[PDB]
Design a protein around this ligand. Structure first.
Ligand SMILES: CC(=O)SCCNC(=O)CCNC(=O)[C@H](O)C(C)(C)COP(=O)(O)OP(=O)(O)OC[C@H]1O[C@@H](n2cnc3c(N)ncnc32)[C@H](O)[C@@H]1OP(=O)(O)O
Length: 160
C-alpha cells in the first residue's frame, strides 16, 4: 500500500508573485541540491534571483504556473517556447508531496496543446531521477556557466 497525495491548485504567475517565486527558487536551491552541487555552485545558481527585474521578466515572458497549498505558494514551473521546461522549483518544506509532478503534468498538457511532440529539459543532477521516472530520457550531459561558475546538467527529452 501507498499514501494518496492531494493535487495542489495551480494558477498562472502574476507580477505580485515576483518575490515569493524568487524565495521558493533560492530556498529550493540552497536546501535541495547539496549532494550534487558545492556551496559556490549553489550560490551562483541562486544568485539569478538577485537581478529582480530580469528574474521576473524570464517568468512573465514564459508560461509560468504556481502551485499552492491552502492558498500558499509552495512551488512553480516554467515553460519556455513550445517545448522547453525552463524551471521547476518546489519549496524544500513541501517536497515529496507530488507538487513537482502536478506542475510538470500541467506543462506537458500546455505544451502538447501548442503542437510540441518532444518536451525537453536541462535537468539538474538532483532532479535527474525525478525526470527519468516521468519518461524523460537522458540525451546529453552539459555544463552551464552561471555567474562565473560551472554546473553540470543533463538534457533529457520526452515524447508527448
Ligand atoms: C530546468 C530545471 O529547472 S531543472 C532544476 C530542477 N530543480 C531543482 O533541482 C531544485 C531543487 N529540487 C526541487 O525543487 C524538487 O526536488 C523537484 C522540483 C525536483 C521535485 O519536487 P517534488 O514536489 O518533490 O516532486 P514530487 O513530490 O512530484 O516527486 C518527487 C519524488 O517524491 C515521490 N513522492 C511523492 N509523494 C510521495 C509519498 N507520499 N511518499 C513517498 N514518496 C512520494 C515521488 O514518487 C517522486 O519520486 P522520484 O524522485 O522517484 O520521481
Amino acid at each position: 500500500g501507498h499514501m494518496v497525495m492531494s493535487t495542489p491548485a495551480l494558477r498562472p504567475y502574476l507580477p505580485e508573485d515576483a518575490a515569493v517565486t524568487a524565495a521558493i527558487f533560492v530556498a529550493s536551491i540552497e536546501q535541495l541540491t547539496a549532494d550534487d552541487y558545492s556551496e559556490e555552485q549553489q550560490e551562483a545558481w541562486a544568485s539569478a534571483a538577485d537581478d529582480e527585474a530580469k528574474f521576473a521578466a524570464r517568468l512573465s515572458g514564459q508560461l509560468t504556473l504556481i502551485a499552492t497549498l491552502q492558498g500558499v505558494p509552495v512551488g512553480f514551473a516554467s515553460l519556455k517556447g513550445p517545448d522547453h521546461i525552463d524551471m521547476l522549483y518546489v519549496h524544500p518544506d513541501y517536497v515529496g508531496r507530488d507538487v513537482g509532478t502536478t506542475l510538470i503534468d500541467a506543462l506537458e498538457k500546455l505544451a502538447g496543446a501548442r503542437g510540441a511532440l518532444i518536451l525537453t529539459v536541462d535537468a539538474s543532477d538532483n532532479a535527474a531521477e525525478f525526470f527519468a521516472k516521468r519518461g524523460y530520457v537522458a540525451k546529453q550531459r552539459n555544463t552551464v556557466s552561471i555567474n562565473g561558475e560551472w554546473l553540470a546538467n543533463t538534457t533529457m527529452t520526452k515524447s508527448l
